[PDB]
């Protein structure tokens, strides 16, 4: 599913990401924008042979099992395929775990490069929340 900006913001708010670990909602919507373009089915292969999955491009090196990343850990304990669902629950719960591991949203390279220290409120501008 390809979310609209406001639809996704609303789904993320309901799932408890608004201010999760100090990160306002615009941040989460901004990251998803540049990570996957709002597409739950987005996948990308990294050079180490690990793959990124879903709306928040969660990495199989650490976070999920996709059965083809030798030596990786499964820190969210889900198949990576569960991150591609049109229901963002699994992606949102795994995100919460990533953002708490000490590095905050700097885990998401597109956030750090494209969202950090920008006007992120602009990504929830005008949505009925």
Catalytic residues: 35, 52
60 binds, among Cl ion, Na ion, none (CB under 5 to 8 A by kind): Na ion
Dihedral, 16, 7, 27, 20 alpha carbons, nearest 10: 0
Among 38, 41, 39, 14, which Cα is nearest to 25's? 14
Give yes or no for residue 79 binding Cl ion (CB under 5 A): no
Footprint on residues 46-75 left by Na ion (CB under 5 A): 60, 65, 72, 74
Options 6, 81, 85, 104; binder of Cl ion; rule CB under 5 A: 104
Cβ neighbour number for residue 22 with a 10 Å cutoff: 9
Part of the chain binding Cl ion (CB under 5 A), chosen from 32-40, 41-49, 96-104, 113-121? 96-104
Question: Is 101 labelled as part of a ligand binding site?
Answer: yes
d(CA 98, CA 38): 19
Give yes or no for residue 116 binding Cl ion (CB under 5 A): no
């Amino acid at each position: 599913k390809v979310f609209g900006r406001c639809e996704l913001a609303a789904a993320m708010k309901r799932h408890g990401l608004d201010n999760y670990r100090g990160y306002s909602l615009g941040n989460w919507v901004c990251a998803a924008k540049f990570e996957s373009n709002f597409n739950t089915q987005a996948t990308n292969r990294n050079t180490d042979g690990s793959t990124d999955y879903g709306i928040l491009q969660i990495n199989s090196r650490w976070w999920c099992n996709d059965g083809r990343t030798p030596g990786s850990r499964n820190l969210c304990n889900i198949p990576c395929s569960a991150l591609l669902s049109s229901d963002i629950t699994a992606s949102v719960n795994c995100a919460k775990k990533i953002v708490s591991d000490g590095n905050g949203m700097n885990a998401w390279v597109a956030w750090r490069n494209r969202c950090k220290g920008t006007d992120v409120q602009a990504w929830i501008r005008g949505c009925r929340l």
